[PDB]
Write a protein that holds these residues in place. Sequence first.
Motif, PDB file in Angstrom:
ATOM      1  N   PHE A 159       0.829  -1.170   0.196  1.00  0.00           N
ATOM      2  CA  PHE A 159       0.030   0.123   0.041  1.00  0.00           C
ATOM      3  C   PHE A 159       1.014   1.348   0.148  1.00  0.00           C
ATOM      4  CE2 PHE A 159      -2.670   3.198   2.127  1.00  0.00           C
ATOM      5  CZ  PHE A 159      -3.356   3.577   1.087  1.00  0.00           C
ATOM      6  N   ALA A 162       2.492   2.001  -3.354  1.00  0.00           N
ATOM      7  CA  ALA A 162       1.286   2.123  -4.323  1.00  0.00           C
ATOM      8  C   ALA A 162       1.103   3.777  -3.982  1.00  0.00           C
ATOM      9  CB  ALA A 162      -0.139   1.564  -4.050  1.00  0.00           C
ATOM     10  N   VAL A 163       1.160   4.317  -2.801  1.00  0.00           N
ATOM     11  CA  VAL A 163       0.694   5.794  -2.654  1.00  0.00           C
ATOM     12  C   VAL A 163       1.754   6.273  -2.827  1.00  0.00           C
ATOM     13  CG1 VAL A 163       0.450   7.232  -0.655  1.00  0.00           C
ATOM     14  CG2 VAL A 163      -0.836   5.269  -0.595  1.00  0.00           C
ATOM     15  N   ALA A 166       1.736   6.942  -6.909  1.00  0.00           N
ATOM     16  CA  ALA A 166       0.365   7.614  -7.163  1.00  0.00           C
ATOM     17  C   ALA A 166       0.780   9.144  -6.819  1.00  0.00           C
ATOM     18  CB  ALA A 166      -0.660   7.252  -6.571  1.00  0.00           C
ATOM     19  N   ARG A 169       2.778   9.669  -9.826  1.00  0.00           N
ATOM     20  CA  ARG A 169       2.101   9.468 -11.184  1.00  0.00           C
ATOM     21  C   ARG A 169       0.888  10.747 -11.176  1.00  0.00           C
ATOM     22  NH1 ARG A 169      -2.846   7.324 -11.468  1.00  0.00           N
ATOM     23  NH2 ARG A 169      -2.598   6.085  -9.723  1.00  0.00           N
ATOM     24  N   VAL A 170       0.194  10.905 -10.298  1.00  0.00           N
ATOM     25  CA  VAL A 170      -1.104  11.642 -10.343  1.00  0.00           C
ATOM     26  C   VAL A 170      -0.632  13.140 -10.605  1.00  0.00           C
ATOM     27  CG1 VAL A 170      -3.186  12.583  -9.203  1.00  0.00           C
ATOM     28  CG2 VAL A 170      -2.430  10.129  -9.099  1.00  0.00           C
ATOM     29  N   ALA A 171       0.631  13.503 -10.097  1.00  0.00           N
ATOM     30  CA  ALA A 171       1.339  14.813 -10.038  1.00  0.00           C
ATOM     31  C   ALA A 171       1.505  15.099 -11.413  1.00  0.00           C
ATOM     32  CB  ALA A 171       2.500  15.007  -9.102  1.00  0.00           C
ATOM     33  N   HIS A 174      -1.833  14.597 -13.983  1.00  0.00           N
ATOM     34  CA  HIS A 174      -2.778  15.886 -13.964  1.00  0.00           C
ATOM     35  C   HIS A 174      -2.063  17.066 -14.327  1.00  0.00           C
ATOM     36  CE1 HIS A 174      -6.065  18.074 -12.469  1.00  0.00           C
ATOM     37  NE2 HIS A 174      -5.061  18.959 -12.037  1.00  0.00           N
ATOM     38  N   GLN A 186       3.721  19.499  -6.428  1.00  0.00           N
ATOM     39  CA  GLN A 186       2.511  18.652  -5.982  1.00  0.00           C
ATOM     40  C   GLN A 186       2.789  17.198  -5.625  1.00  0.00           C
ATOM     41  OE1 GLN A 186      -0.697  20.096  -6.246  1.00  0.00           O
ATOM     42  NE2 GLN A 186      -1.007  18.338  -5.105  1.00  0.00           N
ATOM     43  N   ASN A 190       2.042  15.471  -2.254  1.00  0.00           N
ATOM     44  CA  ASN A 190       1.411  14.376  -2.201  1.00  0.00           C
ATOM     45  C   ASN A 190       2.178  13.297  -1.346  1.00  0.00           C
ATOM     46  OD1 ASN A 190      -0.521  15.160  -4.029  1.00  0.00           O
ATOM     47  ND2 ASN A 190       0.072  14.282  -5.633  1.00  0.00           N
TER      48      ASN A 190
ATOM     49  N   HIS B 122      -7.464   1.780 -12.859  1.00  0.00           N
ATOM     50  CA  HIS B 122      -7.078   3.136 -13.371  1.00  0.00           C
ATOM     51  C   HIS B 122      -8.136   3.771 -13.487  1.00  0.00           C
ATOM     52  CE1 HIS B 122      -4.621   6.564 -14.750  1.00  0.00           C
ATOM     53  NE2 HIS B 122      -5.360   6.364 -15.772  1.00  0.00           N
ATOM     54  N   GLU B 125     -10.677   5.390 -11.160  1.00  0.00           N
ATOM     55  CA  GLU B 125     -10.050   6.621 -10.505  1.00  0.00           C
ATOM     56  C   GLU B 125     -10.787   7.855 -11.170  1.00  0.00           C
ATOM     57  OE1 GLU B 125      -5.672   7.408 -10.530  1.00  0.00           O
ATOM     58  OE2 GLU B 125      -5.490   5.242  -9.761  1.00  0.00           O
ATOM     59  N   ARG B 152      -5.644  17.718  -5.758  1.00  0.00           N
ATOM     60  CA  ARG B 152      -5.830  17.054  -4.391  1.00  0.00           C
ATOM     61  C   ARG B 152      -7.101  15.994  -4.586  1.00  0.00           C
ATOM     62  N   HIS B 154      -7.707  14.475  -7.445  1.00  0.00           N
ATOM     63  CA  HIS B 154      -6.925  13.371  -8.502  1.00  0.00           C
ATOM     64  C   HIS B 154      -6.190  12.528  -7.448  1.00  0.00           C
ATOM     65  CE1 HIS B 154      -8.061  14.437 -12.658  1.00  0.00           C
ATOM     66  NE2 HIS B 154      -8.575  15.338 -11.801  1.00  0.00           N
ATOM     67  N   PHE B 155      -5.470  13.023  -6.662  1.00  0.00           N
ATOM     68  CA  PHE B 155      -4.326  12.152  -5.669  1.00  0.00           C
ATOM     69  C   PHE B 155      -5.396  11.524  -4.549  1.00  0.00           C
ATOM     70  CE2 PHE B 155      -1.746  11.826  -2.174  1.00  0.00           C
ATOM     71  CZ  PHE B 155      -1.058  10.802  -2.231  1.00  0.00           C
ATOM     72  N   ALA B 158      -6.892   8.403  -6.032  1.00  0.00           N
ATOM     73  CA  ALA B 158      -5.811   7.461  -6.624  1.00  0.00           C
ATOM     74  C   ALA B 158      -5.440   6.583  -5.556  1.00  0.00           C
ATOM     75  CB  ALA B 158      -4.555   8.252  -7.111  1.00  0.00           C
ATOM     76  N   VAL B 159      -5.478   7.370  -4.075  1.00  0.00           N
ATOM     77  CA  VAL B 159      -5.148   6.809  -2.761  1.00  0.00           C
ATOM     78  C   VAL B 159      -6.111   5.946  -2.290  1.00  0.00           C
ATOM     79  CG1 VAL B 159      -4.690   7.111  -0.288  1.00  0.00           C
ATOM     80  CG2 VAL B 159      -3.573   8.715  -2.106  1.00  0.00           C
ATOM     81  N   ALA B 162      -6.185   2.719  -4.692  1.00  0.00           N
ATOM     82  CA  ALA B 162      -4.984   1.868  -4.354  1.00  0.00           C
ATOM     83  C   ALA B 162      -5.330   1.311  -2.968  1.00  0.00           C
ATOM     84  CB  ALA B 162      -3.736   2.764  -3.952  1.00  0.00           C
ATOM     85  N   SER B 163      -6.236   1.789  -2.056  1.00  0.00           N
ATOM     86  CA  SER B 163      -6.581   1.316  -0.571  1.00  0.00           C
ATOM     87  C   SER B 163      -7.399  -0.082  -0.990  1.00  0.00           C
ATOM     88  CB  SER B 163      -7.468   2.418   0.059  1.00  0.00           C
ATOM     89  OG  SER B 163      -6.556   3.480   0.410  1.00  0.00           O
ATOM     90  N   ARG B 165      -7.904  -1.492  -4.141  1.00  0.00           N
ATOM     91  CA  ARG B 165      -7.002  -2.445  -5.154  1.00  0.00           C
ATOM     92  C   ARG B 165      -6.046  -3.385  -4.389  1.00  0.00           C
ATOM     93  NH1 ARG B 165      -2.254  -2.256  -7.005  1.00  0.00           N
ATOM     94  NH2 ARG B 165      -1.874  -0.108  -6.905  1.00  0.00           N
TER      95      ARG B 165
END
Lengths: 201, 198
Positions: A159, A162-163, A166, A169-171, A174, A186, A190, B122, B125, B152, B154-155, B158-159, B162-163, B165
Amino acid sequence: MVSLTERRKAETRMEIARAAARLFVGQGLRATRAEDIARAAGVAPRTFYRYFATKEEAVAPLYALGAERWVRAVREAPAELSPPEALERAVRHTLTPAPSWEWARTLIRLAESSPALRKVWAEVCHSTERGLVQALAARMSGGDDNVAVRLAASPRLHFAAAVAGASVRVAAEHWASSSARSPLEQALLNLEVLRGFAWEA
Amino acid sequence: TERRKAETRMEIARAAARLFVGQGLRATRAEDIARAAGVAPRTFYRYFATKEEAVAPLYALGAERWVRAVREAPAELSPPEALERAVRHTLTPAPSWEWARTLIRLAESSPALRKVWAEVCHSTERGLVQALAARMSGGDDNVAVRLAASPRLHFAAAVAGASVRVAAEHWASSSPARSPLEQALLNLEVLRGFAWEA
């Protein structure tokens, strides 16, 4: 020690990959042919096809290289740093231009637009997550291989990785899709979500 | 017509799942999936580029049920309470989904199927972002648009994804703790005190 021939071949391969990125940025994927990339790298089409079967394969190594250098900088960060400090240090040290921002924007966008590069980006995201699991397990094992194996099996590390993944990746995704300048900031914000994470809850 | 096409797509997916479970991926060809679903190979390839892509709609069922439970959660609940409610509602004995167990477990072995599972997680999300933005918008469609642009959100999406998944993967690969619930709730605790707006 790596032989001089292999070092020269590996530089050529990277020059082709960078030429692929430069053209995809300039003029996009659709207008660019393997032959154009070969000319831009200063090699014959036969040399191109010694390393890459397609134009998409030619940029594929750049996605992997940045990811792998980040993961390695997390493992190698000074041992007394906390996981969030190591993750944030490694981001600042390896993911600040090293990828140029105009290139990252275009490559991240192509990971969404191109079927072939969607799969490359997916493969990098997955192997980065696995690599972060191994780097976090090494930072917490105090050198004990059997402790490193138990930690890399832990759903808590899966976990956390993955965080962490992410976070960057999300930074990046996006930032690439929205007209920011600094995906870095960002990504660091995160990563702060892992402060006080319970590695053994 | 579209209802008939969507039923065919799901009949193909269920045929694919049955074969992958019974004999595994390598013994199964797209043409075997097509025969088990009662369609021609040309019909199979109208809906799916590869045999592994045929099980996407089964992974997408679970994903979309979770996203829908987020949107439908009692309106007064906060985003983290909505995410917790949606997990509890999605991951409690909902009918006998020990079926999900085996398909997720199969992904653990096969690169090609792991990629399909990853692509469904994915896609979920973007749905989570849209569902969260709607709940926080106080009804206002143009507030929901600005919020679904937020890094914020989007992140956080994703979290949250992930939680669930990572809890699902670990649950699937464990011995036949029924329900990934507890792992998913522990995972979700990382969003306590997150700043949902500026």
